Amino acid sequence: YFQGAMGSKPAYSFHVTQMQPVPFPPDALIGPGIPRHARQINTLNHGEVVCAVTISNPTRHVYTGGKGCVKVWDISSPVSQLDCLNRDNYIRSCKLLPDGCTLIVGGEASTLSIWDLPRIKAELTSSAPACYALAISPDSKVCFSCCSDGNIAVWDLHNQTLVRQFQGHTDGASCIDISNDGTKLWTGGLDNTVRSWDLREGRQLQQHDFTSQIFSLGYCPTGEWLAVGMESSNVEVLHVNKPDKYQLHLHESCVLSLKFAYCGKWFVSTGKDNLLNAWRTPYGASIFQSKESSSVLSCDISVDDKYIVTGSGDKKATVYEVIY
Amino acid sequence: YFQGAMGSKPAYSFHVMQPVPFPPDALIGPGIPRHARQINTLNHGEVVCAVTISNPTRHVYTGGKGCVKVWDISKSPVSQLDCLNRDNYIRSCKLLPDGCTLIVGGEASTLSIWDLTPRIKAELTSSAPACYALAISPDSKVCFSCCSDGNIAVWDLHNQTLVRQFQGHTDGASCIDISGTKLWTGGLDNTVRSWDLREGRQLQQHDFTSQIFSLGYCPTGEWLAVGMESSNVEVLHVNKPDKYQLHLHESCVLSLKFAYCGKWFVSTGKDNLLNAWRTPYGASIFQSKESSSVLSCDISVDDKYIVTGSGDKKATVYEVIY
Ligand SMILES: N=C(N)NCCC[C@@H]1NC(=O)[C@@H](NC(=O)[C@@H](N)Cc2ccccc2)Cc2cn(c3ccccc23)CCCC[C@@]2(C(=O)N[C@@H](Cc3c[nH]c4ccccc34)C(=O)O)CCCN2C1=O
């Protein structure tokens, strides 16, 4: 059993309009659905840099993406291994379909493997040499892939056919999220921009320009907010429509992953600086911080918000139990 | 400017044991500090055993070896009060409500009464070889002194005469606080005793597993906080059987002081730590690590400042930030 203890830090969360520190409301650090802390419960010794992590629904299995393979762990040694691509190249993203019987694996290879849960059901073949990020539509019919050439590939998962290729981003598309169904696509890139896309009419809506590259992004499940993890080490929380934005300074290096909890009240960000930071939506009050042994490359939160899994540069994954 | 950031620790606050589930106003609320910022260092040069702050806040009084130093906190002392002799420590110094008088107690049979060039107005002479703690009545007429022999001497400050000597403890009386009808005293006999000030007799007795070094009575009533030799802080209800046991010290809890609003309190240890706690279940508000043992503490009447006395032969002034 653990108990809260209040700390303070020099001003790290600012309102941008020029910067002014955020005066936190009383429900910033404590409230229903607000975690008190995160407790490490497992270490998954993958043995390769873990670039992608996904948690099963219901929570039982953890999928870790390393060099050439996906390892499946029973969190109640791997229970199985999924060989997807050349054992010299990294898996960059693996997404489960809502039901949980299908897994889509992307990486440093031209093909996306669709696994039945195990064997390869099908293989979508792209023109691009690599996939850096994947997103599945809430309806489980479409898959969005962020290509190395900056394009966004739109796949029809039923017929295993390409439907379209968005304008993307120049130099590479690094991250993706779907808008609370499911008409807007948000992508980030190495061209210092975040772009929104009309999924019904098929093309670009908005463009947010930044001073550095975007490595991660998340769309708030209760809507309104988009959280952006940058090369600069800053996290920016922008309103989709309003001009108000927050700038968060608790990372000392690149913000590599970002994930909102399903209730939308809080989110996590992970850095090259060994930190997993939990933040209050939207002004970024610091809920908890966990320091790891190496760079934290990827993260996932279970659909019930009870567990967090992180992928590490120390060639492992860590499972945390979120304590309320 | 500073912003709050939530942290967690393995269970350190228990209901007497079961860990305390904190309510939402435990770590955040009006009158609950966010943090404490060091603003001054007072280089006394002797271990600072007693610290008291003027009302209104302007001057801080630090008690060391045969010397009280006066500091204007608005880095060098503005004045010095030499308590003869210079070889013994000042254990307690309490100002009278107005602020023009200072009662100095310590490792000597006499209590000096200073007029505020400052001079010694009078000297109350006790039979005991030392005074470990002082408390002044709200009316400014009586002074209670905790003697080394375990007795509680009651002094009439106007006539400089002893009125009575309470049974005290079977061993030394180390600490004291006024409820202004009930006196609470702690001792080296592992007990906390309450005294009827109107009838002049002993009301209650709380028995502990180790010696009591410090104690405080919550200004809004109900709670008594006890700092112990075991390193534990215990918060006992005056009437109910419920009690809290706090474990954030690794060594003797040497001083303890409630904020005047009664919502929070501080405790200091031989372990170099200053801890701020939520009344009554002891949620950890802030912690400050010092360079040496923290022997004494005071909080200003407005709850804006904390002063601590250190084993590193100095005092530190903190500004409490809300
Ligand atoms: N050692 C092989 N086979 N992979 C290495 C690929 C490394 C990866 N960089 C590309 O994807 C880059 N692409 C490549 O390097 C290609 N050789 C991949 C490829 C191999 C084989 C076939 C086809 C393709 C493109 C890229 C460039 N940047 C990107 C940002 C996000 C997403 C993608 C990029 C700009 C900033 C790069 C810093 C960053 C970063 O900070 N990396 C971290 C974490 C990290 C450590 N090891 C990793 C392995 C894979 C992915 C990430 C990491 C670090 O070094 O601390 C950011 C996250 C990914 N990353 C990389 O350096």
Author numbering:
A (entry chain A): 435 to 451, 455 to 513, 519 to 559, 564 to 770
B (entry chain B): 435 to 450, 456 to 513, 518 to 559, 563 to 625, 628 to 770
Give the text the authors published on this PDB structure.
Transducin‐like enhancer (TLE) proteins are transcriptional co‐repressors that modulate key pathways for developmental and oncogenic signalling, such as the Notch and Wnt pathways. The TLE proteins do not bind directly to DNA to exert their repressive effect on gene transcription; instead, they utilise their WDR domains to bind to DNA‐bound transcription factors. Given that TLE1 does not bind to DNA directly, and that its repressive and potentially oncogenic role relies on the ability of the WDR domain to bind to transcription factors, blocking of this interaction has been suggested as a possible treatment for cancers with elevated TLE1 activity. Herein, the structure‐enabled design and synthesis of a constrained peptide inhibitor of TLE1 is reported.
Briefly, we grew apo crystals of the TLE1 WD40 domain by using slightly modified previously published conditions and succeeded in solving the structure of cyclic peptide 18 bound to TLE1 to 2.18 Å resolution by soaking with a 2.5 mm solution of 18. The asymmetric unit contained two TLE1 monomers and the electron density was evident in both binding sites. Chain A showed strong ligand density and allowed us to model cyclic peptide 18 with full occupancy. The ligand density in chain B was weaker and refined at a lower occupancy (0.83). Overall, the binding mode of the constrained peptide is almost identical to that of the published acyclic peptide‐bound structure. The overall root‐mean‐square deviation (RMSD) between the two structures is 0.55 Å. The N‐terminal phenylalanine side chain of the constrained peptide occupies a similar position to that of the methionine side chain, with the aromatic side chain efficiently packing against the hydrophobic part of Glu 550; this potentially explains the slightly higher affinity of acyclic FWRPW, compared with that of the MWRPW peptide. The most significant difference between the cyclic peptide conformation and the bound SMRWPW conformation is the linker, which appears to cause a slight change in position of the N‐terminal tryptophan and could go some way to explain the lower affinity of 18 compared with that of the linear FWRPW peptide. The crystal structure of the constrained peptide bound to TLE1 suggests that the linker causes some strain in the molecule that may, at least partially, explain the lower affinity.
